[PDB]
Design a protein around this nucleic acid. Sequence first.
RNA 1: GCCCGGAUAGCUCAGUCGGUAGAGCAGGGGAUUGAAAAUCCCCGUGUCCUUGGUUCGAUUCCGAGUCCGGGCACCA
RNA 2: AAUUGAAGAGUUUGAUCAUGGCUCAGAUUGAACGCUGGCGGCAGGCCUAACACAUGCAAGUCGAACGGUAACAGGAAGAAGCUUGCUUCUUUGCUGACGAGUGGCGGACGGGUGAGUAAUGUCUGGGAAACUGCCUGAUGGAGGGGGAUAACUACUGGAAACGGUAGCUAAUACCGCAUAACGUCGCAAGACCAAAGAGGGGGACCUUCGGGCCUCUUGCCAUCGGAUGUGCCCAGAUGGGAUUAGCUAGUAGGUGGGGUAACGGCUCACCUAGGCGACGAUCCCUAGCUGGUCUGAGAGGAUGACCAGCCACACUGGAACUGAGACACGGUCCAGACUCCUACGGGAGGCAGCAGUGGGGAAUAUUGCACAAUGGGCGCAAGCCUGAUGCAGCCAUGCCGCGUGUAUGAAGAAGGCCUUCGGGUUGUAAAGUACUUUCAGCGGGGAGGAAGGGAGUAAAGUUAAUACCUUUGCUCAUUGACGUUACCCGCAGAAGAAGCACCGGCUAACUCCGUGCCAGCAGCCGCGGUAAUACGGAGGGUGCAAGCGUUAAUCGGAAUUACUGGG
Lengths: 205, 167, 85, 62
Amino acid sequence: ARYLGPKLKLSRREGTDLFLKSGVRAIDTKCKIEQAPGQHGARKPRLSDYGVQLREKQKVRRIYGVLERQFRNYYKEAARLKGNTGENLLALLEGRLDNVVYRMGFGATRAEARQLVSHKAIMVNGRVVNIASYQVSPNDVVSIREKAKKQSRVKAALELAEQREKPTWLEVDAGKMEGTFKRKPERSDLSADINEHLIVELYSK
Amino acid sequence: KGDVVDLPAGSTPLDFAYHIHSDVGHRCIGAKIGGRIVPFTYQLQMGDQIEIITQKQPNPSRDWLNPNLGYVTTSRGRSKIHAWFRKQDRDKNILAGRQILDDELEHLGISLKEAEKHLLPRYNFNDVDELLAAIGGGDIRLNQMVNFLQSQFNKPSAEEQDAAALK
Amino acid sequence: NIKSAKKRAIQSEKARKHNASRRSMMRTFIKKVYAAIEAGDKAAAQKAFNEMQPIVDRQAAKGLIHKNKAARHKANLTAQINKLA
Amino acid sequence: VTSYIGGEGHNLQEHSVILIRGGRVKDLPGVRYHTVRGALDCSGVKDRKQARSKYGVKRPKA
RNA sequence: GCCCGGAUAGCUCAGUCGGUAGAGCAGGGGAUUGAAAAUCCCCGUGUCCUUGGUUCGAUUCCGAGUCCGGGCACCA
RNA sequence: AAUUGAAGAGUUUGAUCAUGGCUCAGAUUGAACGCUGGCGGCAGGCCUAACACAUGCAAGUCGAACGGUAACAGGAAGAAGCUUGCUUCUUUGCUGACGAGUGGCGGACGGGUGAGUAAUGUCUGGGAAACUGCCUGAUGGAGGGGGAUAACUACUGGAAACGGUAGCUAAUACCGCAUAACGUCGCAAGACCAAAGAGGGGGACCUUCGGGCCUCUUGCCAUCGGAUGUGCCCAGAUGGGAUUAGCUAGUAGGUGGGGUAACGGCUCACCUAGGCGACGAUCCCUAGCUGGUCUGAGAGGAUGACCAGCCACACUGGAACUGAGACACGGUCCAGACUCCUACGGGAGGCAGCAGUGGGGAAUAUUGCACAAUGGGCGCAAGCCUGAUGCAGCCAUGCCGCGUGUAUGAAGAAGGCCUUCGGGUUGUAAAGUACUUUCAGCGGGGAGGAAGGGAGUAAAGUUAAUACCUUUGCUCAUUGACGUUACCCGCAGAAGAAGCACCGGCUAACUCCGUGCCAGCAGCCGCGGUAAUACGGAGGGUGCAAGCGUUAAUCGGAAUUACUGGG
């Protein structure tokens, strides 16, 4: 239940980086990004209004790697939970375990952070877990289990931790491969590049 | 009854009844083997003894099954089912048969007695059951039958037609 | 059908005739009372009433006839006879 | 009911055993049902490789 | 299980007699139109169930294999 | 904190605004279908034929109710094979227990199904004219006999099913008798009403050395209550049709008797002549009702399948018996149709219980495992039965989860498709390279669901009593259907894990070739007539994902039934 295909092109459908592929190369420069998702990528569609709706949804969902259905489930969560539907939905998606993992710098990509998480490699609150859609509760902790602790991919991926803006809400020590979640991310905290209200409307139709 | 009989490797208990009798296959509603009741899907094997159970006479297990050519085996014993159905519709057909038959029978070829001495030894016929069943199915290749009807040839002046065919 | 519990059936019949017996018995005593009430023989009818009381009530506690039915009889009959005086 | 046979090529003739789905043609002032190609006695459409769910042909093993 | 017959151009149909595969309808072609119809001038159209064998001629002989329409018969 | 939520679009016209229908985006299903298919958690699963059904199981249990013992196990022990104490030949209800039987309780619960049912049901709220085994509080009793049956024999009918006559016998079976009241009846006075035992042990006491006696346990009968269940009565609510308008003679009251556990036309007899009806009687059509489920912002509209309360039915039609309770799903008697047995005289059976066959259908599974869990039945109990239930199997069937790999990788490879042929694109995708190994797979380890219950010991009450017994701690051996459990650890290698729809507008996404109003698509508008973004194919693309489509189905949009909310 993952895209499992040429992940970079998705960046061009959005004609935007989705952080889908970070390992080495800086600017994707192997994509000719934001120019041709397909054979007529050269096209310049006026793109219908509803199209912007569908497009926003696709953006966020591509980002977290979240598939439609579950994403919708999340939407209802953003409905009956409380506060601005959009904001909640955002924070909730941030709450995804794997998203927290990649966000902890562990794993070069969201998907790779998942490659870890499914392999029981991650241990939250001193408890091994496998599922990536895990809802990381407030003030928890997590660390790579010792069996694959700091090994191989890890350190290079955590070396990447510096390249990013390093999140406020979460905590880390790295020596213990720690990931002490605290408060849920604030609306401003996230990327902000997205316009959730659109998606809000989308399902609000 | 201790008797055994060969079958294609992958048959059904229904089919077996046909070796006992075609009508017996149509009587079938219950099947058992070694005291184990089995569905009309069981693929018989290893000379294992049958324990048939029946009642009267109906299209039975193939009513839609073998007709659907799914889990009732063979293109053979099923034929009995096929006709078993058909003779019903055929009866109604034989009647609607005489109907249209009679029309042409005297509209062109004249008489029933004329029509009778026709197909009886002309195109394969068997009995008036079939001959009068002819248009409830078109089995004979009718009109070629009207041709068998108009098979007579006095044609003297008809030669004058062929001459004109050249003219 | 098949149950060693089917025995209940035979046991119930073994009970029916028994039950049935008392019924007709009880009825006749009651009958004589109305018969006596027909006669107008308040005294004799009274006697018959005395010659039914132990029977009906016994059967009541015995479980055949309920008891409210018993009281019913004694009641309305007593009404019949006092009115018969 | 009269009923349409989707796609070109159809072995159906007179009798036979064919399933009927809803829907209608709108072009044949009358037909209001479609035979289920690729199901029952009805044949799967011959030589199809695109959207064969409809028409019911199995995936090309080739 | 045995016995008896049907399969002919795309549809319906002619056939055939062990000898050199047609009629009718649609269909296509040409004129005309943007393309049709009407009208006008042309036309083709098939491994004869398959297959080998008797085949210079089998399509008419022969089964073997096909489906197809009857009939009897296994009633454990 | 416990509701804070309501979107429009295409389409008639040359064009517009109107009105106005049809159609779409959404939500949803006890789904089927097509293609496709990795695993797992959890739910769900015959909506049609209330069609017929082979086979197995679905209700038995109690010796601590009884005479007895058909079996085995032993123990008193006749007699015997010889290792003269090796077993044995064998007799024995005498004990552990228990074939058959009498009796208690259960079978009226549990489980199924929705046919019937438009109210005799159900929902809601009320009420009086009642009954209520098992459970329980209270108070008394629990005396004194007798007569039978079965069992069992004998004989015996009958193919069988299944009885016949003769005697034999017990009981907490049955039936008088005495004794009754806060019991019933009765104005009162008066009258009548019941029943039994069995079990453990234990002194001295006493033996007809059965035992009496004691005390403990329970069973027994009565009566007033509790609770529980049940019958019952009324108001209102509970489909559609007026192209059904009159319907009713136990019908509407009363009286009187009878009947019910109980009110009553519930039923009879006589009397009255009423009763219902436009706020829809009667009739017809359809349907099990509800908590609820569905959708909707709401009000509403549709539905009532799973879980649950109620109701009705148990092959069809009908009746009744037993019993606290049924007019009785795996009871009875009768009629019918039906299936089966027959020695053809005469008998047997009802899956709408769990599974399962066939049948019908678009369509819905295993003739699995288990009493370990709860619950129920019986038994003081230990136990036994339990297709309730608990689990397993079966199918993507719904919901939910995870995986089918991750990082690098430009030479923009090959091949493929477009090219304005110079390229673009496929596309970092691949290869190649470096890693990780959930689940698959293999091999080790392995909670919880387990509480109880049995044996022992101590104590505490119990009494005469150390003891029996009950209560409680303590000790011992134990009880897991699932189950090579869940979960965990090692292991090999990316190894085994991606389809489906769509791509003219609605509506996300374009080109080339083939066909040329043909073949074909289509939900609506429509596309196809030799340059098609719509048909087929390719590439590419979008959406979705072990699903995806299609059809069916309800509501939303539809303020196109408008009460909210229209003319």
